[PDB]
Symmetry: D2
Subunit: 466 residues, 4 copies
């Protein structure tokens, strides 16, 4: 734990109230060249619900896949201390690869002026992956032990020690329309709600599917005595949907198209619409425009969290880091080749860059690891961060009128999660932000701010000029 001697924070009824001065700057560029930078300010009073649910309910769509199954296993492994045998000895479970669970943040310096970091989840209170209550859907009924089997991600022994328990977790029938599977459809569709009472699939009753899914969420909520719940798409990858004026452009139409069983309405569209109606945060972990404007509207209306559009591969991450550092130092990357072979894949991206005076630079990144062992911890983080956000709200403080604010909620598309997605969906007029490093500080500073610490600046003036 950490606590800061500051006057900008007061603990109410198990609620942190923080005043933050939001400095920024507007700049215009003159039809000549010159940039005119007009600074900016806007104080805020942030309210952090200080009580983390004791048990967070999670509902994975594609719960039978490599990521879903290893997610459940990672929770069971850590919660129950189930150590497993390995070719390299006996090993304790952990959560390596997770930012919430294993990375740290700088708090400040010490007597001698040397940096001092603390667990990324030590500052403010966050829910533990170990307190996750998972279940979900999957268009295939294998159970999670059998799921762990076909994925071949975990160690034989480990898989064995979780068998008894994971043979018990059974995914619910999901909704499966055939024309939308654009890929990542490893298993057969033998567990579906959507069956014309004869036995077939069919794309009819799309609204009834939505209701079924909504009811699903409600029942799951009670069977576990859970208040907060969070759904997340980790299934196959579908075909993008053609947003057309009248079907999925505005709220009114989206819902409407569903009842009509419009064809542009896809499985994820429903799970998303359902999640939203139940006011439960929905995360799109796969590439695809499930979040058409129409659905987005709905979210804005219900005032319920959404995020997503691809889990950030540990390769598409490392590609960002590398390419940025490059431009940041003045090199002009002029070419970018590729590789890529779930579990145990090989990635290789090569950069042919320009140096000064006709020179060139050839950089090659070779990457091998089991995908899911990276995608899973990253899923843990998303869930853990959209949980914390859901408990934060802010207030716009007017400098010449004490206490002029009615506490509001994070604009719906939590862009704060971007660090973990490839295509950061975004508010209507903004250009998305990538660049792992920037995306992380944003999060680090947000957390600094809530406990009253300033934006990290690294100027370290207590040495650069004594």
């Amino acid at each position: 734990s950490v606590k800061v001697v500051t006057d900008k924070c007061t603990y109410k009824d198990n609620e942190l109230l923080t005043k933050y001065s939001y400095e920024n700057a507007v700049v215009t560029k003159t039809a000549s060249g010159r940039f005119d930078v007009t600074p900016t300010v806007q104080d805020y009073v942030f309210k952090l619900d200080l009580k983390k649910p004791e048990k967070l309910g999670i509902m994975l769509i594609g719960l039978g896949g490599n990521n879903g199954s290893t997610l459940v296993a990672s929770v069971l492994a850590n919660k129950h201390n189930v150590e497993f045998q390995t070719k390299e000895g006996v090993k304790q479970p952990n959560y390596f690869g997770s930012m919430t669970q294993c990375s740290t943040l700088k708090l400040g310096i010490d007597a001698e002026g040397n940096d001092v970091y603390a667990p990324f989840n030590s500052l403010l209170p966050m829910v533990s992956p170990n307190d996750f209550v998972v279940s979900g859907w999957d268009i295939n009924n294998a159970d999670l032990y059998e799921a762990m089997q076909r994925s071949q991600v975990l160690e034989y022994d480990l898989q064995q020690r979780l068998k008894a328990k994971m043979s018990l977790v059974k995914p619910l029938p999901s909704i499966y329309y055939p024309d939308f599977i654009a890929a990542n459809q490893d298993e057969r569709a033998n567990n579906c709600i959507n069956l014309d009472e004869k036995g077939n699939v069919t794309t009819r009753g799309k609204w009834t599917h939505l209701q079924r899914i909504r009811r699903d969420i409600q029942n799951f909520k009670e069977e576990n005595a859970l208040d907060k719940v969070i759904v997340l798409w980790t299934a196959n990858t579908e075909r993008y949907v053609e947003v057309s004026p009248g079907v999925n452009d505005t709220m009114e139409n989206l819902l409407q198209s569903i009842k009509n069983d419009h064809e542009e309405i896809a499985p994820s569209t429903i799970f998303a619409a359902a999640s939203i109606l139940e006011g439960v945060p929905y995360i799109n972990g796969s590439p695809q425009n499930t979040f058409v404007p129409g659905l987005v509207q709905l979210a804005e209306h219900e005032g319920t969290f959404i995020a997503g559009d691809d889990l950030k591969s540990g390769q598409t991450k490392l590609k960002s880091v590398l390419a940025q550092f490059l431009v940041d130092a003045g090199i002009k990357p002029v070419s970018i080749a590729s590789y890529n072979h779930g579990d145990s894949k090989v990635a290789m991206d090569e950069y042919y860059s320009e140096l000064m005076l006709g020179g060139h630079n050839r950089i090659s990144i070779h990457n091998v690891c089991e995908d899911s062992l990276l995608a899973t911890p990253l899923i843990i983080d998303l869930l853990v961060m959209t949980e914390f956000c859901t408990r934060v709200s802010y207030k716009k403080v007017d400098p010449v009128k004490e206490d002029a604010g009615k506490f509001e909620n994070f604009y719906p598309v939590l862009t704060f999660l971007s660090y973990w997605l490839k295509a950061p969906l975004t508010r209507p007029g903004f250009h998305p932000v990538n660049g792992l490093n920037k995306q992380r500080t944003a999060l680090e500073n947000f957390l600094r701010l809530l406990i009253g610490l300033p934006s990290q600046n690294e100027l370290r003036f207590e040495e650069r000029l004594l």
Copy 2:
């Protein structure tokens, strides 16, 4: 390209800028158990930034005839005269690619729809461009720079030919040669030394006279070229480390004595360094090795002369550190990092532990003639230590303050840490390193200087209602 920020923390006398900045930080004290107590600290300053930048800057390179050196001189003339050159891939315009000061940009703020607005790194305040450099220097080998550029087979053939007329005119000054000190990094023979005895043969006797010639040398260069501001940078061999002792190189009085006693522990490096200090020309040691022993540092603190320190980041070590960092910022536990090193080639193998017995292996293979990397880095280094020389700071206590009298940066330019592998320092402070962070320093200091907050990445305008 110019930048004008509408603030009030900035007052412009005339060719003298005063800026008010509030340095927020924190001290923490974890104690008994796992609880960190942070006490935020503030300390106000007023930064004076002398707006007058030298129209011509003198750059004196030790190792002028080597790979870095010849290509430095080459890129100056080539960029300055827009001398295009032919290649198999077509005609090519010279540039300064690989220079942070010259080719990278910065985010100042946003615009009408939220999208960031970037601007040239050298646009903000006012900096000396490399095109207006005038360079000379020393080297233990007399070959002029057409030949040197010829040896250092780094530049395209045609380009070396369009530059032959001008580069031939440049010849390094005789240097100081103490054979036992040359650990490594000398690809060329020594036929240009000032330390010749009363018989013409390389001596280690008379080091103080060697020190004087270097000053005479520094003085002459400024005189013969107008130039008032001049900076020396060692880019020569890498000598064998010197052993730090008492009564020799510990103080500022017996380092001057030691030199006079022709005592050992005084490497060519030491002399050049001290000579640079004694003339108020900041000195940059771009190669690994002590040099900046304790004694020397004093001499520079006194006299008020800046000094940048120890070695200069490779374009793979400045990629190793960021690759490793990225990993550790995602919760991955590197277990092993192995490094190749060699156009030349570098390889780094990272085996880091994943979750539940899983493992990940990343392989970074890097290829390029690193002088095209080291050179733009040398420029940056020079431009930046120049800027830092027109900036004095004022430590203010808001309810009194420091009743006027600015201070130059603590001699050691630990701002230049983005360009040196072994960031020099002053006692007790654990060296930093952290490219991303280190660069974030220069951006923030370039910002506050003109009244800018120091960037956060919260985008409340977008994430907040």
Copy 3:
């Protein structure tokens, strides 16, 4: 030069006559397991025309491409000693990358028993690349200097020193049918014979095209006072052709389809048919079935050399070497990934192989170089070897009837060149042979044999048992 004290070789009228005992073995496999190996023998009298043309005429189709232009330049560079300046100093021309010009062969041992090799072209007399007289076609009229320019393969300076001369080499109009360009069509078709007298291309007059091409070869032959000529396809890569019963299955039909301007008749088909009619060796350096059965028939009839089906990339070569060595040692390659970005390309093939006891082996090959600098010397070799073959003929000697042989010519599809092609076309009932190493020895032994030396055996008994 080399000369061997042996009784199996006699020099006639500037003609080597060699007796060779061709040992081999037939084996059947019993419906049980056992292999019954019935050895074999068949003596031969080989006749080698000992006089190499003073000037060999070469006609490249795609003479304007990266390979064609750098081929001409490599000949001009070496013949005229034109040294060029480089970033690394002044360099003399050479023929690195060529087996005929730069590799060696073991002849035998010495006083102390240490191996002794000799230039691969020192044994018997072969024509020098420096004595090549090149010209050819290209569906684009840039001249070869301009050709050298757009390819960017050679050093600026070198390109400059060959400018005067190469601005003089101008490719002839070629035949260009649009529907056959499946790829590698970097330049525009502005130099074609096939133009309906109006100005367009059209696919009519296919036979007249053949005649034009034949006449082309004849004129080239005389304008240079050349006897021997060799055409080679080094142009774009076309669409495979559908061999159908009646158009290109037998000779009679092929020729026929041409007159008919059948659509299955493609540009390479004609250059090939023409080459054959003129009895000049035709080499197919690109992937594509230009050699349909019908064309093959024709070759068999005229008794004229053919070979080809892709130039062997220095990567598809290195892939063979590696994969073989692997199986040869018992490893079971189970996977093979890929890369590939002419000039300056990057290849990367990765092998995931199985070791004993569930173990695995991960091998990755990364390759970067300018393609053409490898493809060109390899083109030199093909030309140099199909030239030598063209001067060899053999005789079947019957062991119980002195001198029963009428000297014959190499079966038409010189499979001896395979070492340099990817898809080694082959005689009707045989399964092609790859495996660079085997493919090379075959050539080494053939040459050994002609000068009377036995098949290399490496048993080195003068030490393994004294």
Copy 4:
């Protein structure tokens, strides 16, 4: 799987095969200028191949408790008992992958339509399978093989558990420990040594008695297990080279003396070697280092005992050599070859010159636990030196001959050169190396043995009319 070639160069007495072979070769003498004069040479032999192969072969490993050793013993039992094991990728049948004798094939001839016919490498003649091995050995560490296999974290966990009952029963014999000789390769402490003085502490005194215990040890193993044929292979540490001198290890008389004088230059290796010779058991040195000094070689020539020599090819050095060779067989001029080396990882960078100033860069990155590579290689080594032990040759002069009396192979099994990085030899002959070639030797010798020509790749049946 059996092979029966219809020839007449092969006569089968009964469990004794005689083969007639004509060894064609050539001597050449380049002289004045560039002209090679080759004079073809012939020398006829009769090869006797004792058809009786041991039903059980004793394998004594020095270093039995190490990585190679435990996995050797493991693969024997696992293959022999068809003990399948579980993995994340499913249940897996044990095998002998990586063994040339066990899993690679050969071309004997063609068939009805020209297409080659391949057959198992161990099908031709008759060889001892690894499944019928009986292994014991020494190691300076007493840990039994369940534990050893446990340390050497090379085998899958489940597989180590299905083999725990049997591997626990096996414990290495006490070895010989001379601390100063251990250059490197000892990952484990020494708590199992026979060279303890009259007080129980490791001595270097009494080397001859150490030599005797090794024989007693060899004798016992054969007795206690029936076995008549037994082969020892050093797969222990790699010791510091020994210095060759006069009156100590030069002859066969003062190497026996030296040992008795407890003289130095006698490494544990030397003793094991000599002990193996003195019992007629062939000895295989699978690690770099002299050992096979000159003296020792004599002792083995005498006594008629085979000896395989120096180190054992890595699965990357046995890929470096072939990669380089391939390049040089295409006319490319390697200029630089750089080697990494580390499951473990290896990297090789080849920069070779192309035509007209062009350059090519090949990068070979290799990964795998190399014991799964070294182990099958050890098997092969053993199977093959066994075969070579049932083959005597007869040097015949066709118009007289050698009026009967075969000869064993010259002690040094330079046939095993495909498996050893530093192919040992006898004076004057420049070491060979050339994987492809070296393997082509074994194929040709396996061929002639049964009356086959020795393969050419001319395919006159296809290329000839």
